[PDB]
Amino acid sequence: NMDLDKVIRKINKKGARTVGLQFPEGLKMQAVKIAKAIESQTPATVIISGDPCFGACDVSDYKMKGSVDLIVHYGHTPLPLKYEVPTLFIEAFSNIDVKKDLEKCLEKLEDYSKIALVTTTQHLHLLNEIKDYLEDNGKEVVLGSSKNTKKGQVLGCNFSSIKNLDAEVYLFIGSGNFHPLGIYLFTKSPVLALDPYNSEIRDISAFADRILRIRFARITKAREAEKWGIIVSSKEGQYRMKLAKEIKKILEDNKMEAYIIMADNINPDILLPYMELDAFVVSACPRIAIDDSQMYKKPLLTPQELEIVLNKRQWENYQLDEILF
Amino acid sequence: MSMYNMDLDKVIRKINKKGARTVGLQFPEGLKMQAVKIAKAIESQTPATVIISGDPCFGACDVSDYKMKGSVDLIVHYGHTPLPLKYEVPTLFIEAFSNIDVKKDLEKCLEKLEDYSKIALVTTTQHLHLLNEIKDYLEDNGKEVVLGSSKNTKKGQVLGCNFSSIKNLDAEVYLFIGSGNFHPLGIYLFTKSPVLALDPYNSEIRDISAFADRILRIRFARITKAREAEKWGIIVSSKEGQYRMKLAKEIKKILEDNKMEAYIIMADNINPDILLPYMELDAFVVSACPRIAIDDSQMYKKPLLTPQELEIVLNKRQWENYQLDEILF
Amino acid sequence: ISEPVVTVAVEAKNTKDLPKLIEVLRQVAKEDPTIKVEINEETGEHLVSGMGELHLEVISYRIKDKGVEIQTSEPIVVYRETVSQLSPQVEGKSPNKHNRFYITVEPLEDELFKALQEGKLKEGKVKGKESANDFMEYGLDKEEARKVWDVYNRSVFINATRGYLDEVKELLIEGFESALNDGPLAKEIAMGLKFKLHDAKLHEDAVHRGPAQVLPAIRNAIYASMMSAGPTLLEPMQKVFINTPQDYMGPCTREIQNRRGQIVDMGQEGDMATIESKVPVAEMFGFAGDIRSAAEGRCLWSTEMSGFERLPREMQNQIVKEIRQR
Amino acid sequence: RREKMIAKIKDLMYKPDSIRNIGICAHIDHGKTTLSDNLLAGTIDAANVSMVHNYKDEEYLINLIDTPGHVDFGGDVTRAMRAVDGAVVVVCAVEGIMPQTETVLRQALKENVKPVLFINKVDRLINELKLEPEELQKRFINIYMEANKLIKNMAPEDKKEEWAVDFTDGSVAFGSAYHNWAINVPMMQETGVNFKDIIDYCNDDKQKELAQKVPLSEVLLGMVVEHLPSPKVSQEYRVPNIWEGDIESPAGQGMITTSPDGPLAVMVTNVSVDKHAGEIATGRVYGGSIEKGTEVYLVGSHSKSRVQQVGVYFGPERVNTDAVPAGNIVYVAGAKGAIAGETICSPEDKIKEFEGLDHISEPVVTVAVEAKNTKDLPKLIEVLRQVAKEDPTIKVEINEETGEHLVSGMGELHLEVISYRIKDKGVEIQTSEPIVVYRETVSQLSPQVEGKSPNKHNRFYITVEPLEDELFKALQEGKLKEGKVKGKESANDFMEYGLDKEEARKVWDVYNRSVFINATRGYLDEVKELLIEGFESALNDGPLAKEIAMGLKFKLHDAKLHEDAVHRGPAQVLPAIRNAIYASMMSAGPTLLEPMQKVFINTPQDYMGPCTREIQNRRGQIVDMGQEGDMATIESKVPVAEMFGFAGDIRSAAEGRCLWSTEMSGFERLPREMQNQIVKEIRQRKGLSPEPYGPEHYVG
Numbered sequence A: 001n002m003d004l005d006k007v008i009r010k011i012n013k014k015g016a017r018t019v020g021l022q023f024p025e026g027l028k029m030q031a032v033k034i035a036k037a038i039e040s041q042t043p044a045t046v047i048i049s050g051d052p053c054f055g056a057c058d059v060s061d062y063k064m065k066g067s068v069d070l071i072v073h074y075g076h077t078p079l080p081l082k083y084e085v086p087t088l089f090i091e092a093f094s095n096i097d098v099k100k101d102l103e104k105c106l107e108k109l110e111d112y113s114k115i116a117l118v119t120t121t122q123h124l125h126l127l128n129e130i131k132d133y134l135e136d137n138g139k140e141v142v143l144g145s146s147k148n149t150k151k152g153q154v155l156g157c158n159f160s161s162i163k164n165l166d167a168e169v170y171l172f173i174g175s176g177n178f179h180p181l182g183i184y185l186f187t188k189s190p191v192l193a194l195d196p197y198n199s200e201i202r203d204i205s206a207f208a209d210r211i212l213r214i215r216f217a218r219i220t221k222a223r224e225a226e227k228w229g230i231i232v233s234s235k236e237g238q239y240r241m242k243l244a245k246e247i248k249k250i251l252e253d254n255k256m257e258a259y260i261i262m263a264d265n266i267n268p269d270i271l272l273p274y275m276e277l278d279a280f281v282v283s284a285c286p287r288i289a290i291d292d293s294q295m296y297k298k299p300l301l302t303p304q305e306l307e308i309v310l311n312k313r314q315w316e317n318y319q320l321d322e323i324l325f
Numbered sequence B: 001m002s003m004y005n006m007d008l009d010k011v012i013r014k015i016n017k018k019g020a021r022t023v024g025l026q027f028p029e030g031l032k033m034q035a036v037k038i039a040k041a042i043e044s045q046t047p048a049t050v051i052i053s054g055d056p057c058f059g060a061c062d063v064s065d066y067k068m069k070g071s072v073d074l075i076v077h078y079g080h081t082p083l084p085l086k087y088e089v090p091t092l093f094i095e096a097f098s099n100i101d102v103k104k105d106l107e108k109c110l111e112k113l114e115d116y117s118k119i120a121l122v123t124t125t126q127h128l129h130l131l132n133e134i135k136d137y138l139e140d141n142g143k144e145v146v147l148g149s150s151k152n153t154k155k156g157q158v159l160g161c162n163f164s165s166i167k168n169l170d171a172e173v174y175l176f177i178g179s180g181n182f183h184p185l186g187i188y189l190f191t192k193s194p195v196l197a198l199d200p201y202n203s204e205i206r207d208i209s210a211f212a213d214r215i216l217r218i219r220f221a222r223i224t225k226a227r228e229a230e231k232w233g234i235i236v237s238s239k240e241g242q243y244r245m246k247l248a249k250e251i252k253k254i255l256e257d258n259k260m261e262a263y264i265i266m267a268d269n270i271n272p273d274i275l276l277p278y279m280e281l282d283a284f285v286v287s288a289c290p291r292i293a294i295d296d297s298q299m300y301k302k303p304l305l306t307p308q309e310l311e312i313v314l315n316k317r318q319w320e321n322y323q324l325d326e327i328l329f
Numbered sequence C: 001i002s003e004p005v006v007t008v009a010v011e012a013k014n015t016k017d018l019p020k021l022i023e024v025l026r027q028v029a030k031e032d033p034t035i036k037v038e039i040n041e042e043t044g045e046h047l048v049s050g051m052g053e054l055h056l057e058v059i060s061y062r063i064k065d066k067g068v069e070i071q072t073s074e075p076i077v078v079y080r081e082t083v084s085q086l087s088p089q090v091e092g093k094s095p096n097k098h099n100r101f102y103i104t105v106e107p108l109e110d111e112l113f114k115a116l117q118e119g120k121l122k123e124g125k126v127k128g129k130e131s132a133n134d135f136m137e138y139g140l141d142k143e144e145a146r147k148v149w150d151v152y153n154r155s156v157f158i159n160a161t162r163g164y165l166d167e168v169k170e171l172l173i174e175g176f177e178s179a180l181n182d183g184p185l186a187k188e189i190a191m192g193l194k195f196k197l198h199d200a201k202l203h204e205d206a207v208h209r210g211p212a213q214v215l216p217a218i219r220n221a222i223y224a225s226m227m228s229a230g231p232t233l234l235e236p237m238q239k240v241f242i243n244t245p246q247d248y249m250g251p252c253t254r255e256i257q258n259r260r261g262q263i264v265d266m267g268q269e270g271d272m273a274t275i276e277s278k279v280p281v282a283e284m285f286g287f288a289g290d291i292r293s294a295a296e297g298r299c300l301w302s303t304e305m306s307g308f309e310r311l312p313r314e315m316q317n318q319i320v321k322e323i324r325q326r
Numbered sequence D: 001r002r003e004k005m006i007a008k009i010k011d012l013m014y015k016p017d018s019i020r021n022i023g024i025c026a027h028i029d030h031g032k033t034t035l036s037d038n039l040l041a042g043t044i045d046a047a048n049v050s051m052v053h054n055y056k057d058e059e060y061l062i063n064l065i066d067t068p069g070h071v072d073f074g075g076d077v078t079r080a081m082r083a084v085d086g087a088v089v090v091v092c093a094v095e096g097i098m099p100q101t102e103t104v105l106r107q108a109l110k111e112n113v114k115p116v117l118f119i120n121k122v123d124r125l126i127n128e129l130k131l132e133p134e135e136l137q138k139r140f141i142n143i144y145m146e147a148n149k150l151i152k153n154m155a156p157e158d159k160k161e162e163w164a165v166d167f168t169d170g171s172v173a174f175g176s177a178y179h180n181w182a183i184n185v186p187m188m189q190e191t192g193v194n195f196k197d198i199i200d201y202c203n204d205d206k207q208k209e210l211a212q213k214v215p216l217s218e219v220l221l222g223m224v225v226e227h228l229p230s231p232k233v234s235q236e237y238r239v240p241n242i243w244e245g246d247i248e249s250p251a252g253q254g255m256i257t258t259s260p261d262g263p264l265a266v267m268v269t270n271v272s273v274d275k276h277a278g279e280i281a282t283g284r285v286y287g288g289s290i291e292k293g294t295e296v297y298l299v300g301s302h303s304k305s306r307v308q309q310v311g312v313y314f315g316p317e318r319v320n321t322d323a324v325p326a327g328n329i330v331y332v333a334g335a336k337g338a339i340a341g342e343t344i345c346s347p348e349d350k351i352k353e354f355e356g357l358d359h360i361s362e363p364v365v366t367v368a369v370e371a372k373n374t375k376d377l378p379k380l381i382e383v384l385r386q387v388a389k390e391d392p393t394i395k396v397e398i399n400e401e402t403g404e405h406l407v408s409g410m411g412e413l414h415l416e417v418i419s420y421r422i423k424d425k426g427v428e429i430q431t432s433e434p435i436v437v438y439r440e441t442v443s444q445l446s447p448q449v450e451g452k453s454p455n456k457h458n459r460f461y462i463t464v465e466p467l468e469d470e471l472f473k474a475l476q477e478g479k480l481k482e483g484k485v486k487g488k489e490s491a492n493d494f495m496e497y498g499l500d501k502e503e504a505r506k507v508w509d510v511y512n513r514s515v516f517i518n519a520t521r522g523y524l525d526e527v528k529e530l531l532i533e534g535f536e537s538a539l540n541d542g543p544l545a546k547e548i549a550m551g552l553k554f555k556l557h558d559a560k561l562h563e564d565a566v567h568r569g570p571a572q573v574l575p576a577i578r579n580a581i582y583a584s585m586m587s588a589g590p591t592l593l594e595p596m597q598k599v600f601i602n603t604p605q606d607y608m609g610p611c612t613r614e615i616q617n618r619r620g621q622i623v624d625m626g627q628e629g630d631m632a633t634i635e636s637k638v639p640v641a642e643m644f645g646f647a648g649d650i651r652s653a654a655e656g657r658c659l660w661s662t663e664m665s666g667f668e669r670l671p672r673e674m675q676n677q678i679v680k681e682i683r684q685r686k687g688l689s690p691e692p693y694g695p696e697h698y699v700g
């Protein structure tokens, strides 16, 4: 839910002639309704950023620079990124009825006493309710926090907050099964996910088996590769040029060729012309390699997976990629 | 393998002379093929690190100056003569001139031009260097040939969004030397004149008028549909050369003046997938490179229109004055 | 209107008389309510869809009333598509392979189809819940009927996702309409389909699911489910009434059979005979010529709609080839 | 010590008359192992074990060669028997002559093996049934009557009397291999044991006393020297039935006479990659002399290698040797990658093959294996690459999309053995139920068909025809390298093997028994490479079932590109060509092909009817029908899809007297009436759309 009255508050204060709107693709179809309201209530012209947008890493402050005086960005908690354009982050808390999914969750959590909670931007508002519920039903509830992440909150490349909980089980609240996968990989504890959208409850160790094996296969094919591509992103929150250049030197030290490729959105199509390159390392978002591996013919590896390739980490010690600041 | 002169020589000596230590390489999709070969050679001959731009690149309007700001010391951009637009980064243009000889096709050119005394020559960038020899042949065989220049385009060159260089020549025929329908297509739509095109690869000389009329009848049908549209998008591009926000906003107010809704949407690359979310919008007007709306319209269910076509929808421009839009600096 | 059976393409000889060719087309469609018109944004042809050869011929004539110098193509038998068995549940996967949505498709109940065709049941997205009375009135079992999400292009798309389906509603309706516009058989308008949502799941969040994820998943599931239900292309049929002198009885009966005609009823009044037959519209092109020679001009004949019946099994492969090739 | 024995073996190996090349023929629980081990005594499971034995003031060199008896791996059975001249037939005295005993004895007799009979587990007759001496006599005589029936039916007609087994002259003996004692009638008339003593020693558990002056190894190896033939004696009659050559030829005559002077001619018996050692081929020299550091031409490989270390056996150990002459059992290292059954010879003198193939091993059944714990994984890959090194018929892929380790081999049983062999290496795995390998092709020439890109302004025209059989077969049998056509006047080779000259010049890439060929004269030099990639990608998963395509000519006729030469990239070209290819194949009568086996049965001729019936029930075609003595040979072709369970069904149908083999025949076309069903099964199984997208999904 879009927090329109607050957006309006901020627009009118800061005297906007022109306002940009940013959404993940999941929220874009509310851009017209919001643009229509703001243009009705203020003298401002609304510019919808029509750009595909994954996260807080993906602010179009360079694209919208000069075109809009303020950016309203929905669905994300801001990162430690130094915003050029004035920006308002609206979390857009879930339009949900969480209620008689609580008892179902309790049912599946019978075996466990000390529980860690994890959730995402859109469900932050539900933490306390569910924490106090579990406590009044005999559970001990621990919520992680960290430098970047609020109490109980995580991101796809910021799992720091749940590294040090020592809970016996972890309950993730929400959809997106990258998050529970990350929880499972880092904690190596049983992990349940409640998807409050369609009421699905599930163990993520199951879904990990078959993904880990796929990653393994990827890695194994990559062991044959003699020419590598190293993908970096022009997205401000994905930009890891330092790392990319370190990886290049590493691969060259292992007497292989490697070439740095920089792009905004990464997709299979944009690797298609580099036919001499036999595999790729992602020096941008850790999710790309993991979530979209089925879309790429050639192996796409996280930097951790490349470590495995080079035998400078064991498969024993597989680790997701994380994006620090 | 090299169909085009990439002038590795020049790029390397200027890189070294200027002391650049990180260099960005931008290729159109026709030359991305060579990125790795090129990259390997530059890294073997300089201690500079090469950054290959993986993003699409349609033209000179689409330099990655913004994106690579701070990241590289120098951009080498291939395949185009530059638009004179503002550079955030040191930028070298390499045009990548074709290694092709049209001499062997000039006889059949002459036969196909029995009916024309006054010719415009036109090419695109990679065949610019061959205009001389074509022009000399033609004039030695009783033709009068004119080279058009303009503020934006070199002598005898078109681009899909600037035909400025054939505006005031008023010839019987325009002879295009190049590869694809698009450039001959654009010259036909702007001039409504005889347009011949020599493909110096097919060795095939073709009159474009048939395909042009086919296109135009589909543009008619798009405009027909757009007349029922009540809620509109105005598409704007963050592409350096394609940014026309002034016009976008003007069109906004014009549509509102005509009691319709209009919303500006800005992005980098325009494709049908980015526009699927805006379910409310019935048709779209393209303030970016006009050629998207013309060339790719079959990929879009909803009508994509140039500003000029919008004028026809609103009965503010005559059907007889259907025209391509242009980009000028 | 005389339910459209023949569609012919008409275009302007001067591509500049175009502004008034639009006026001409909308005048012709106003003058004759049996003629329905649309300009193909996909193709660039202005299509005129009418009630047979003669029905279209009147419209191609009334381009003279509008003064548009035009070419008019030979008419095509405008087909509709349906399915002959129920399908097992077929899964559509989202653009990333991120969502799996399972649908079963089966031929819609005759009572419901009739109710839609004869206008007892209005078309469109089933929004108001208490208006579910309409679905019941049109023959659907009430509790099952209230799960209808769209009534779209002669079919119904229905939701059995409990809890599930919570994401996609608007996108699924758009995808339903798009799926019915161009069916599985040869991209012909679909008729008389029930689409049931059997199961559903989703990988990424519901704030990473947009239109490029929902649209492909539903669209691919829907085509695949229709194709696995024994998809049938159908031709339009006519009830054909021929009134002729008895003298030409044998030749007239021959002419009917030659056009895929089967005798329905046969009445005699004095020296005259009235013959009631059923025949496909597709097989009756140029019928004025054939029926004239076969009866020495004695027969006067006319046609009424008998439905968009199934095109014959042995002829289907060729007709599909011709349509797809075109 | 050892030195003395090894000197004596090197002295021995140059006399063919003083060798015995022998094997042990037994039912699976009848005590082959324990006899083999204990025989060596005066464990094993090896290439071969050698024994030097004194018999009547003369020394003899006995090679106990491995002789598997798994009757549904009949290739291995028959190959083993081909190596041996004599067989110790071993029968449990309680259970008598078993199905399996008859079967393996019969193959021994067929390949000109002289049998000698040992009745084992005498102890348990006398413990279970307590016979009178006359009742012992009569059970021995009954077993040796059954033995003699198989010798009278199967043996050479020259030999049916001489090779028959006789109690009198001691070609039959009895004892217990376990308790280390054996006796024949000649040993009874040397020690003065009667049948009553044997019964007392067995009842009173005094079997160690007995063991002492009628030792298993002395008695039974004496019996082997007396009764079983030398290589020199044997090869005069064995050579023509083991080898199909010109017998008047100098290599032929050199094998006949057991000439170390002849052209070298050897047969590889097994090859085993050994745990501290390397890869070794154990073999029999029929003729000539193999030498260390010598070049030797594998006739199966149509190739060469140069022998590093030659040697012979000293029990289960191997003694390195300068030369190994004919009549011996050989170990060699540096055999290239020669397999079991391989014909090795002199290069320059280059003999004819003992055992070959009529069609190179294409794997026809695929099974999925994974490691049960997601942690033995990196080692599972070491196990699988060991397996694939030791067995070249087994091919292995790792699915990047799925994470499965796919193992493709020669049949259900071949793969069963492999997923067993994984557990000997110690990856705890789960094995899936196996699938058949299909191949896709087209049966007609296609119309010219247009493939359009997403942007609808790029557009290629191609036709597909079945590739010419000459070209297909020359790719299959390795005359022509596959891959991108580089050297241009190499188009000659395509001409030679049946393609037209203008066709040949314009062949562009070759791949999956297929060729993409360029009908545009005059251009394309950027897009060429993209077209190739699109082509190869398209053939990896064909249209019908996403199975490997083969057997195709693609002709590129004509093509139009709307964009600039230098604005056109793979997002235009690759869908356009790849759409063209599927559409063109679908308009060429697309065909599924199934793999087929040549299936060999040997079974007594009462079971002719049942075995022929069982083959026909599985869509089998009878090919040829042979007859040797009491038994019938059946040659068949049978589809691989109808061969699951066959070992069970044909055991019942022939009361376990079946010995059978398979070999790859190639891929027949699947029948028309079958195809729709089978394609729907494969697409169902892969989670594809139930019907396969036809020309409509590639047209506009």
Ligand code: SF4
Binding pocket: A054, A055, A056, A057, A058, A155, A156, A157, A158, A237, A238, A284, A285, A286, A287, A323
């Ligand atoms: S995981 Fe990737 S998309 Fe998500 S916040 Fe991190 S960098 Fe952005």
Ligand code: SF4
Binding pocket: B058, B059, B060, B061, B062, B159, B160, B161, B162, B241, B242, B289, B290, B291, B327
């Ligand atoms: S059409 Fe114009 S704006 Fe677009 S790429 Fe070509 S030159 Fe640039």
